Amino acid sequence: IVGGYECRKNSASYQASLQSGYHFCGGSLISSTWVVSAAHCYKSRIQVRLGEHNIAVNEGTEQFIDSVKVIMHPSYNSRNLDNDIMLIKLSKPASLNSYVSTVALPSSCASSGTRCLVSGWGNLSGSSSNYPDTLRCLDLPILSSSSCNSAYPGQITSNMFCAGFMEGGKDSCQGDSGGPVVCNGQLQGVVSWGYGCAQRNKPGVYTKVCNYRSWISSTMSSN
């Protein structure tokens, strides 16, 4: 996360890390058995890590659970990262407690100006590799489609929204992919892509989770 702050101990307890083999992505817990992440972080076998804020050391709260099903969106497109969302079913349910909680699915789509929180263990800089051991947090607004489309002309689909700062300086970054953008208790975004990190007029692009409410429901109900 570039220009964010370390999350408080009690914050962001829905946050998951995925060991997609040896690649790292974030994710978020939406029920005791299901995790959502970005489809570009796919691997057929993933270990989900929960209840962690400092990944370098033991805090006693950690839960490591392997996936049993990994379901990429049917129309995920690796060319432009359209429909960059995936669901992971855990082989055993997570034990919810203070450090491991679920985040609610969106009831509706959030509008521009809604303030949200993004979180992750990704890169702290847009010109060098600096990765944190504690989870970082960042408050940011959803930006208008006019802003989003003018920042990335011809690249933004209906399944994407931009969030962050056109002046740059604060953004999600590499390693945050798959992680949650939560607005008023609901999961509205999945960290997906951007050009560089925290550059002016290049805000982050997030998968628009409120477009997938039926798909996520349907998939959980019958898998």
- Of 42-61, binders to Ca ion (CB under 5 A) are 52, 59
Token pair for 52: 């962690």
Do the annotations mark residue 58 as ligand-binding? no
C-beta of 9 vs 23, nearer to its own copies: 23
Which listed option, its own copies, Ca ion, none, makes contact with residue 186 (CB within 5 to 8 Å by class)? its own copies
Rounded CA-CA distance 7/5 in Å is 6
Q: How far is the CB of 138 from Ca ion (least distance, A)?
A: 21
Cα–Cα nearest to 206, from 31, 83, 72, 78? 83
CB of 37 to Ca ion, least distance (A): 19
In contact, 177 and 41? CB cutoff 8 Å: yes
Helix (H) or strand (E) holding 29: strand 23-29
Name the catalytic one among 13, 53, 82, 84. Answer: 84
From first CA to last CA, the distance across the chain in angstroms is 33
**Closer Cβ to its own copies, 9 or 134, answer by number:** 134
Per DSSP, what are the bridge partners of residue 207? 160, 190
Does residue 84 have an active-site annotation? yes
Please confirm, yes or no, whether 177 is among the known catalytic residues: yes
Is 176 considered catalytic here?
A: no
Hey, how many other C-beta atoms are within 10 angstroms of the C-beta on 69? 14
Q: Report the nearest approach of Ca ion to the CB of residue 212 (Å).
A: 30
Q: What stretch of H or E contains 221?
A: helix 213-221
Per the annotation, does 6 bind a ligand? no
Both tokens assigned to 92 = 């055993």
Nearest to 88 by CA among 31, 22, 135: 31
Using CB under 5 A as the binding rule, whether residue 100 contacts Ca ion is answered as no
Query: Which has the closest alpha carbon to 1: 145, 136, 116, 191?
Result: 136
Which of these is catalytic: 40, 82, 119, 172? 40
Q: Is 167 marked as binding a ligand?
A: no
Answer with the entry of its own copies, Ca ion, none that 221 interacts with (C-beta below 5 to 8 A by kind).
Answer: its own copies
Is residue 133 a contact point for Ca ion (CB under 5 A)?
A: no
CB of 201 to its own copies, least distance (A): 10
Catalytic residue numbers? Answer: 40, 84, 177
Binding residues for Ca(2+): 52, 54, 57, 62
Binding residues: 52, 54, 57, 62
Name the residues that contact Ca ion, by CB under 5 A.
52, 59
